[model samples]
Target: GPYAQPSINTPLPNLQNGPFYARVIQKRVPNAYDKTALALEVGELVKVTKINMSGQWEGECNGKRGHFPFTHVRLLDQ
Candidate 1:
């Protein structure tokens, strides 16, 4: 539901680019205060930790960590 807009333009930084290097993950838990918001507004940058064959990834940033849904974030390898 978050990425269901007709003109959803996710303004993200390409820290890397390769043959499926890593996936981006949201480091914040959704809250009611962000009602109708598209993506996570945590303003926290994620660090590339590791990659897996399943195309999933792991990282840390702003006190949050986990293997988030791959489709939620763009892949960066630079």
Candidate 2:
């Protein structure tokens, strides 16, 4: 994993280069109505614009755009 590997300001694995879509495992948004769907997970291809909040990267995916906590996303491919 890029985060696990030793490096300085490593861009997220799927910032632009990716073979698989990712899933949002944990969202940091303050108001979440669908705890179940939010809890379940939504897999979608995303674009990472900026890295923030420790390991978190912010970007847009599908037609829904928002910030996702870094730990929430699981990269689907190398």
Candidate 3:
């Protein structure tokens, strides 16, 4: 099946509104050695914060906020 059409930036504020956003592209397992990163499954939407994380990203997901791999998700604007 085709993916849902992305909602372009519109004139309204919602949970997904933010400076940056992404859709999960991969799955990550929780690491006991590194407990501050977010573990997300494919297709989860997250609102990312931070403009200079390099290969890292911070966002809210699964009712928690933490850093996640930048390669784990794709930008919404792409």
Expressed as tens digits, the lDDT of each residue in 1-78 for candidate 1 is: 221222433222222322233344443564323431222433434543444324444444333444444445554443
Flag regions of model 1 displaced more than 4 Å: 1-27, 30-41, 74-78
RMSD of each: 10.8, 6.0, 8.9
lDDT of 2: 0.46
- Mark the regions of model 3 whose C-alpha exceeds 4 Å error after superposition: 1-18, 29-34, 51-55
Model 3 lDDT at residue 54: 29
For candidate 3, report its TM-score: 0.50
Better candidate number, 1 or 3, judged by lDDT? 3
Error of 1 at 25 (Å): 8.1
* Model 3 lDDT tens row, 43-66: 876556533332444565544456
Clashing pairs in 1: 15-78, 16-76, 16-77, 16-78, 17-77, 17-78
The prediction achieving the highest lDDT against the true structure is 3
The true-versus-predicted C-alpha distance at residue 16 of model 3, in Å, is 15
Q: Of models 1 and 3, which has the larger TM-score?
A: 3
**Residue-level lDDT tens digits of model 2 in 20-78:** 34665554443234331222334544444444545545555544445565466765553
Q: Who wins the TM-score comparison?
A: 3
Off by over 4 Å in 2: 1-6, 9-13, 28-55
